[PDB]
């Protein structure tokens, strides 16, 4: 759809699941900006983890072999209230 040709999911620490539309060539920073649009969390305050690996901002989803319907874990950098 309008956000991307592939769907992935983002799991937060409260158990919520966010659906994200992305493309294989999206950088991790671009993914964090999409998450910011859906959450208000600034990109610099997001850590994304896939299968235990912290994802780097300047690499792409394709670099991590992240594919349709995969789940990323979002952890906020700063403890939230």
Number of domains in the chain: 1
35, 20 Cβ separation under 8 angstroms: yes
Would residue 72 count as lying in a domain? yes
HEC sequence for the chain: CCCCCEEEEEECCCCCEEEEEECCCCEHHHHHHHHHHHHCCCHHHEEEEECCEECCCCCECHHHCCCCCCEEEEEECCCCC
Would residue 1 count as lying in a domain? no
The CATH number linked to 60 is 3.10.20.90
Tell me the structure's resolution in angstroms, rounded to a single decimal: 1.4
- 6-11, strands of its sheet edge to edge: 17-22, 6-11, 71-76, 46-50, 53-54
Query: Which candidate, 19, 27, 10, places its Cα nearest to that of 64?
Result: 27
Q: Which domain holds residue 10?
A: 6-76
Would residue 81 count as lying in a domain? no
Would residue 57 count as lying in a domain? yes
Distance CA 41, CA 47 (A): 11
**Solved by what technique?**
X-ray
Would residue 67 count as lying in a domain? yes
């Amino acid at each position: 759809g309008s956000g991307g040709s592939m769907t992935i999911y983002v799991k937060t620490q409260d158990g919520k699941i966010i659906k994200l539309e992305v493309n294989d060539d999206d950088t991790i920073l671009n993914v964090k900006k999409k998450i910011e649009e859906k959450t208000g969390i600034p990109p610099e305050d997001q850590i994304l983890i896939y299968k235990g690996k912290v994802l780097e901002d300047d690499k792409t989803l394709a670099d991590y072999n992240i594919k349709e319907n995969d789940t990323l874990y979002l952890v906020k950098r700063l403890k939230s209230p």
